[PDB]
Write a protein that binds this ligand. Structure first.
Ligand SMILES: [Ca+2]
Ligand SMILES: [Ca+2]
Length: 505
């Protein structure tokens, strides 16, 4: 196993992130800097408005989804609230941290959707947080029921880049212009266009958070159940920055949040924000043969958590070409092909919309679980780990989750102990077993044994989140799962899922 990192758990310069502290060290007093101030709660955030007005700092946003302000502030003034420059002497009260509001930037071709399903995401609305949507594209017409433009303030949908349209169509395109061939994963779903990225595909953290905020504020009005963020930076993140917090909070408000892993692989620790947010679904990219792409970002997070959780097709994906744009590699007037974890992301968002159509009562955690547990183990010796996560999502299995046999095991393992559980299986094309546990400081591993008692799969990442094993055409008989503490104790749960019959001996 890879030796791990630190840890370590106290790194900020008072209120300033290290990155922001360095930034302002090279600046002079009268210059301006764009920041996000995260407070410990909403009332503390509110108290600070009057003080920031006094100093003449300019509040760009006052957020609901996080207790934070997006603030443009002179260095001298920022030194004052940071407690680094005495009039106080005191740090601004109730501040958790102040970060930089920095800028985010975004052939064998293939269709996104290789399935025919009974569901199509009817009655579900997906928010596309991106460059916009070309709602005049034949595959999207009448779909865009909601719209906001935080870049230019235009009040009618458009897309001046191409990226957001391509993404929107992978998620929910009807495929009308190819008679279905390049439909998205959720052809019956509605869309809301949330433009936070400019024509160059660039945007500020503050704008992206505001787009997440808007989606949450407006979730009831437009029936938003899923949001899509095909955007991020890839500076290794621990998922505690303002944008990560915002997407985690949006998850808790009841939205399925689906985020691109990033395109900065194959190196490990290339998962940044908001890819690192623990709660959301972070999505890597495979090519058309189910092989992880070289560019797909690898985890773990900066704090050693397992990311991405799943991967999806993200290499030269054909989808809607926004009127007047030419992103990637044009196929014809209506369609263009592009690679990226940005293409993988909406594939998963649309599947999420199927599942929510199929199961109106499912929470986001339930959607995430079904995706993880049903994902195809396309590369057994690398699953679960920080390139493939749990494997490549399978829209058919995810959507038909409930038709499958299930078995749940639980127990406790002490430091370096194990537990085993036998189960019987027959008539199966597949079985998977997925392991969770409570103690995030503990590393548990998962092993799967055939009826001869021989190990046919293992899952032993060092990085905490889950473990995942399974087998295709498992021979009928009594199989064993073993839960092993590599280090540390925990209470655990293993879900076994199969299309065969599942029993106990
Ligand atoms: Ca494995
Ligand atoms: Ca492990």
């Amino acid at each position: 196993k890879p030796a791990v990192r630190n840890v370590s758990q106290q790194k900020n310069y008072g209120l300033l992130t290290p990155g922001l502290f360095k930034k302002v060290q090279r600046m002079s007093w009268d210059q301006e800097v764009s920041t996000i101030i995260m407070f410990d709660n909403q009332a503390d955030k509110e108290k600070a408005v009057e003080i920031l007005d006094f100093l003449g700092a300019k509040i760009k946003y006052n957020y609901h989804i996080i207790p934070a302000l997006a603030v443009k502030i002179k260095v001298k003034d920022l030194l004052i609230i940071a407690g680094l420059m005495d009039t106080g002497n005191a740090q601004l009260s109730g501040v958790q941290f102040i970060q930089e509001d920095y800028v985010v930037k975004v052939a064998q071709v293939m269709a996104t959707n290789m399935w025919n399903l009974g569901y199509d995401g009817s009655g579900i609305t997906i928010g596309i947080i991106d460059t916009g949507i070309d709602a005049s594209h034949p595959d999207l017409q009448g779909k865009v029921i909601g719209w906001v433009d935080f870049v230019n303030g235009k009040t009618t949908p458009y897309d001046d880049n191409g990226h957001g349209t391509h993404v929107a169509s992978i998620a929910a395109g009807t495929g009308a212009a190819s008679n279905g061939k390049y439909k998205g994963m959720a052809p019956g779903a509605k869309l809301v266009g949330i433009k936070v990225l400019n024509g160059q595909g660039s945007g500020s953290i503050s704008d992206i958070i505001n787009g997440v905020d808007w989606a949450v504020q407006n979730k009831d009005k437009y029936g938003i159940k899923v949001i899509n963020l095909s955007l991020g930076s890839s500076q290794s993140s621990d998922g505690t920055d303002s944008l990560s917090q915002a997407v985690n909070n949006a998850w808790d408000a009841g939205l399925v949040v689906v985020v691109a892993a990033g395109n900065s692989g194959p190196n490990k620790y290339t998962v940044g924000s908001p890819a690192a947010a623990s709660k959301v679904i972070t999505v890597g990219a495979v090519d058309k043969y189910d092989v992880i792409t070289d560019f797909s970002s690898r985890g773990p997070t900066a704090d050693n958590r397992l990311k991405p959780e799943v991967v999806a097709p993200g290499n030269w994906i054909i989808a809607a070409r926004a009127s007047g744009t030419s992103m990637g590699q044009p196929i014809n007037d209506y369609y263009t092909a592009a690679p990226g974890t940005a293409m993988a992301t909406p594939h998963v968002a649309g599947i999420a919309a199927l599942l929510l159509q199929a199961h109106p009562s499912w929470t986001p955690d339930k959607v995430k679980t079904a995706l993880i547990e049903t994902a195809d183990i396309v590369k057994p010796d690398e699953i679960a780990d920080i390139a493939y996560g749990a494997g490549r999502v399978n829209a058919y299995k995810a959507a038909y989750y409930d038709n499958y046999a299930k078995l749940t095991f639980t127990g406790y393992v002490s430091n370096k102990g194990s537990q085993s559980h036998q189960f019987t299986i027959s008539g199966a094309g597949f079985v998977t077993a997925t392991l969770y546990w409570d103690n995030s400081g503990s590393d548990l591993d998962l092993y799967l044994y055939d009826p001869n008692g021989n190990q046919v799969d293992y899952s032993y990442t060092a990085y905490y989140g889950f473990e995942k094993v399974g087998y295709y055409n498992p021979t009928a008989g009594t199989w064993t799962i073993k839960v092993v503490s590599y280090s540390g104790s925990a209470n655990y749960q293993v879900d076994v899922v199969s299309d065969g019959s599942l029993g106990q001996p």
